[PDB]
Design a protein around this ligand. Structure first.
Ligand SMILES: N[C@@H](CCC(=O)O)C(=O)O
Ligand SMILES: N[C@@H](CCC(=O)O)C(=O)O
Ligand SMILES: [Cl-]
Ligand code: NA
Ligand code: NA
Ligand code: NA
Lengths: 256, 255
């Protein structure tokens, strides 16, 4: 049968290009948690697939003026991909336009910053401007702040929006580099913060989780794959396989 | 006017309780708790009226392996005896095969409730001994997790629970807590419930971490159009901070 087209995005340790000396081709180019997940889904559901990086490099947000979506969300809306297998947050505005499986991982927005400071919460950032802060442009964290009616988060959005050319970044990688090279705190998903702080011993999570959400496999609205992938995810979780996959991709040396 | 939806639920503090009062209470007015607040929010967002009915057999729901029949709130949905189940109802593979669920409104896992002051640190420590008995709610998701598990520790625990089931499987979380307090017994319990119980009884503790991960969702019959509408409403409530506020309201109180 026809191979499914799977849109994804580079994001360690979910999706990475494998390191090698020989050139790699096709699906063999990729590894990571989400790649292992895709392989398990493919064997459980009995499909073959072709992995394609989303061409615009975005997760997906709606443009407030013209109403168009971008990123992996737009690929699904336009039926250019059958699945999005990535650390793609299940959100209200996305669920209105695409379908998602039930979550394979649960997480929330938090703060990545340097250690040793009196900053302990989002409120501490919101009430000042000397320490800049931001988020990935056109992702779920940005959209959370843009939409929020909560005073602290609305204030933070006004700051980020004013300073967006400097403080909104194109990837988590760029946000980490800003934390490491300037006085800057990055609003980042907690699963990713866990990965980063175990490898950057001068960095830490500040405060707890600001919200709660899951990552799910995206499908076009109405796809028959959505409910089948939910069932496969529930089976992999119950059997302990998702936990093993998390340990594989997050485990490492650590910090004193 | 549209037919009111029949909502099946189960008594379980602080999700669903009878209100305390001296005058008698009637109809929906009898009930309070996190899930009742959730139901009220869903009804205003989606535009329905409802009648709350406690599940007749007092069970969450499991399948009988001899005759294939389900029980509990799961069976009420399969048979279209309820439109919705709004309860701490775990989303599980075996249930998702037969009913539909919204996306989760809370995330949790199985853990262990026991008395303080013990070297027992995990399910592995329990499984390797038989002096301390252990069990779970009969015909709920925790029992079914053990019954289905191929993981050696958990399959050893199921063998023990099954052997001793008339004594160690209980009808409700409340009966499990009473067994922990009145005998040498550890209860396999969902973590959000452990959090509630241990903040109010300072002689009790959680043992170990979470053995698994799952969510609670609103149940619907398979194919219901309410499932995806309720998912959207839950996502909106989460993002606005209302689910967090509801958790704080119903779990607030310390040791
Ligand atoms: N995982 C996010 C991108 C990263 C973020 O927004 O923090 C998304 O699905 O949009
Ligand atoms: N919440 C459970 C019942 C309690 C338990 O199994 O621990 C269920 O949905 O079956
Ligand atoms: Cl769903
Ligand atoms: Na990328
Ligand atoms: Na949807
Ligand atoms: Na289902």
């Amino acid at each position: 049968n026809r191979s499914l087209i799977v849109t994804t995005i580079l994001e360690e340790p979910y999706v990475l290009f494998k390191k090698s000396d020989k050139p790699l081709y096709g699906n063999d180019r990729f590894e990571g948690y989400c790649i292992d997940l895709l392989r398990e889904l493919s064997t459980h559901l009995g499909f073959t697939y072709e992995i394609r990086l989303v061409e615009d490099g975005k997760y997906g947000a709606q443009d407030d003026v013209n109403g168009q979506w971008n990123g992996m969300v737009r690929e699904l809306i336009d039926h250019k991909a059958d699945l999005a297998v990535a650390p793609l947050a299940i959100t209200y505005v996305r669920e209105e336009v695409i379908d998602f499986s039930k979550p394979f991982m649960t997480l929330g927005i938090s703060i990545l910053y340097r250690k040793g400071t009196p900053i302990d919460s989002a409120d501490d950032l919101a009430k000042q401007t000397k320490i800049e802060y931001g988020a990935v442009e056109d992702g779920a964290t940005m959209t959370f702040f843009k939409k929020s009616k909560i005073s602290t988060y609305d204030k933070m959005w006004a700051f980020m929006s004013s300073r967006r050319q400097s403080v909104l970044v194109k990837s988590n990688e760029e946000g980490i580099q800003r934390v490491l090279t300037s006085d800057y705190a990055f609003l980042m998903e907690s699963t990713t913060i866990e990965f980063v702080t175990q490898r950057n011993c001068n960095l830490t999570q500040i405060g707890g989780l600001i919200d709660s959400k899951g990552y799910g496999v995206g499908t076009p609205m109405g796809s028959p794959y959505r409910d089948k992938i939910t069932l496969a995810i529930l089976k992999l979780q119950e059997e302990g396989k998702l936990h093993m996959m998390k340990e594989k991709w997050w485990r490492g040396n650590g910090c004193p």
